[PDB]
Design a protein around this ligand. Structure first.
Ligand SMILES: Nc1ncnc2c1ncn2[C@@H]1O[C@H](COP(=O)(O)OP(=O)(O)O)[C@@H](O)[C@H]1O
Ligand SMILES: [Mg+2]
Ligand code: NA
Ligand code: NA
Length: 382
C-alpha cells in the first residue's frame, strides 16, 4: 500500500504532509518551497500550476486563475461571488446558475467550474507527494474552513475525486491545527483553544472546546478579505509615492510595474519577520529607471498599524460569543503565514496578558501537519 497524505488546500497557499515513522513530513515542491500558491495559468502551449503559475501573473493576468476557494460550492447569483468578481482579472461566467472561470488555453476559449481548478492544484500536491515518497498516493485527508457549508464541502470532496484522490475525510482547518499540537489528547477535562489564523487573504479566529477527544467549535470570527496581501498593498502604495518623489513619475497606470513591485514587497515583508530592514532591488521598473531602495521593520509596522491593531476586534467578538473570558482559554495556536510577523505576535500576546503562544510548528504548515496525522490514524498507519 501507499501512505495517506494530509492536504491543506488554501485560498492563496496549499501544503501537503505525510506521517511516517511517528514523525510528520511537510513535503517541499519542485522549487524547494514547503507551500505552493493555489494558482493555475493557461498559455498558448501549456497549463502552469503553482509557482510556475504565480511566476508569470503580471504577464498573463486574464488567463491566470486564483481564489478558486472563494467560488467553490457557491452559486453565481451569490452576493459574495458578485462582489468578489469585481476584483478578479479573469472572467467569471454564469452557467445554469453555477459560476465558471473562462480562460483562453492554446488559442481556444475554455471554461472550468471552481472545483476543476482546485483539482488541478490538488493534482500538483499529489505529484509533489509522489515524487517524494517514490510511490503512488491515493488516500488523503483534505481540510476546509470551519464555516464551510455542505455544498462547499461537497465541492471540495469532488475536486479531490477528479484529481484521483480518495478523500478519506474532510476536517476543519482549526481542528487540524489543534491536532498538530496534540491538543486532541484526552486529559480528563474541558480545554478551550483559540486558533488565530492570519493567512494570505483570509483571517479566521476559532474557539474550540475539546473534551474527551471531541471537538466543538464554540465560536468563529475573522475577516474574509484581510490577510498578507493587504500588508503588501500598503508597501506598494508607499513605494509608488516614493518613486514619484525621486523620479517624479506615476507608475500606477502600468500594470506590469505594479505587479513586479508587489512581488518585491512580499519578499521584503518576509525578510522583515527575521530582520530589521530589507532592500528592494528592481531593475528597469518604469521605462528604464531601476528602483533601488529599502524599508525598515519600524516603517513596515507603521504602514500597517491600523490593520495589525484591528486584528484584535474579531478576537473579542469570538470571546464574547463563546461566553468566555481571556483567562478561560487554555491554549492559543498561531496559524497562517502572516502570524510570523513579530508585531502580530506581540499584539496577541499583550492582549492575552503575556500568555505563551503555540508556534513551534511553521504556522503556514500547521493545518497540513494536523491533516497528515489524521490521515495516518484513519489508515491505521498510526
Ligand atoms: N515570514 C513571513 N512573514 C510574513 N508573511 C509571511 C511570511 N511567510 C509567509 N508569509 C505570508 O503568508 C501568506 C500566506 O499564508 P498561508 O497561511 O500560507 O496561506 P492561506 O491563507 O492561503 O492558507 C502570504 O500573505 C505570505 O506573504
Ligand atoms: Mg490557511
Ligand atoms: Na494554506
Ligand atoms: Na487563510
Amino acid at each position: 500500500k501507499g501512505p495517506a497524505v494530509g492536504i491543506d488546500l488554501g485560498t492563496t497557499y496549499s501544503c501537503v504532509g505525510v506521517f511516517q515513522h511517528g514523525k510528520v513530513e511537510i513535503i517541499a515542491n519542485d522549487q524547494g518551497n514547503r507551500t505552493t500558491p493555489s494558482y493555475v495559468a493557461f498559455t498558448d502551449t501549456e497549463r502552469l500550476i503553482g509557482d510556475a503559475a504565480k511566476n508569470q501573473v503580471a504577464m498573463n493576468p486574464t488567463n491566470t486563475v486564483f481564489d478558486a476557494k472563494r467560488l467553490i460550492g457557491r452559486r453565481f447569483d451569490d452576493a459574495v461571488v458578485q462582489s468578489d468578481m469585481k476584483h478578479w482579472p479573469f472572467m467569471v461566467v454564469n452557467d445554469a446558475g453555477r459560476p465558471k472561470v473562462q480562460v483562453e488555453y492554446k488559442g481556444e476559449t475554455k471554461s472550468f467550474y471552481p472545483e476543476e481548478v482546485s483539482s488541478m492544484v490538488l493534482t500538483k500536491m499529489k505529484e509533489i507527494a509522489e515524487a517524494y515518497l517514490g510511490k503512488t498516493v491515493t488516500n488523503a485527508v483534505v481540510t476546509v474552513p470551519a464555516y464551510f457549508n455542505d455544498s462547499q464541502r461537497q465541492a471540495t470532496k469532488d475536486a479531490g475525486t477528479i484529481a484521483g484522490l480518495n478523500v478519506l475525510r474532510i476536517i476543519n482547518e482549526p481542528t487540524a491545527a489543534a491536532i498538530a499540537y496534540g491538543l486532541d489528547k484526552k486529559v480528563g477535562a474541558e480545554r478551550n483553544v483559540l486558533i488565530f489564523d492570519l493567512g494570505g487573504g483570509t483571517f479566521d479566529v476559532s474557539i474550540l472546546t475539546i473534551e474527551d477527544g471531541i471537538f466543538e467549535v464554540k465560536s468563529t470570527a475573522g475577516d474574509t478579505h484581510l490577510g498578507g496581501e493587504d500588508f503588501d498593498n500598503r508597501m506598494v502604495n508607499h513605494f509608488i509615492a516614493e518613486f514619484k518623489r525621486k523620479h517624479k513619475k506615476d507608475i500606477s497606470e502600468n500594470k506590469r510595474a505594479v505587479r513586479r513591485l508587489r512581488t518585491a514587497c512580499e519578499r521584503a515583508k518576509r525578510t522583515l519577520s527575521s530582520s530589521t530592514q530589507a532592500s528592494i532591488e528592481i531593475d528597469s521598473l518604469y521605462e528604464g529607471i531601476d528602483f533601488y531602495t529599502s524599508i525598515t521593520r519600524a516603517r513596515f509596522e507603521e504602514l500597517n498599524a491600523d490593520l495589525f491593531r484591528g486584528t484584535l476586534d474579531p478576537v473579542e467578538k469570538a470571546l464574547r460569543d463563546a461566553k468566555l473570558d481571556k483567562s478561560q482559554i487554555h491554549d492559543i495556536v498561531l496559524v497562517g503565514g502572516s502570524t510570523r510577523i513579530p508585531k502580530i505576535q506581540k499584539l496577541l500576546q499583550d492582549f492575552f496578558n503575556g500568555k505563551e503562544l503555540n508556534k513551534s510548528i511553521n504556522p503556514d504548515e500547521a493545518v497540513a501537519y494536523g491533516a497528515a496525522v489524521q490521515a495516518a490514524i484513519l489508515s491505521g498507519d498510526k
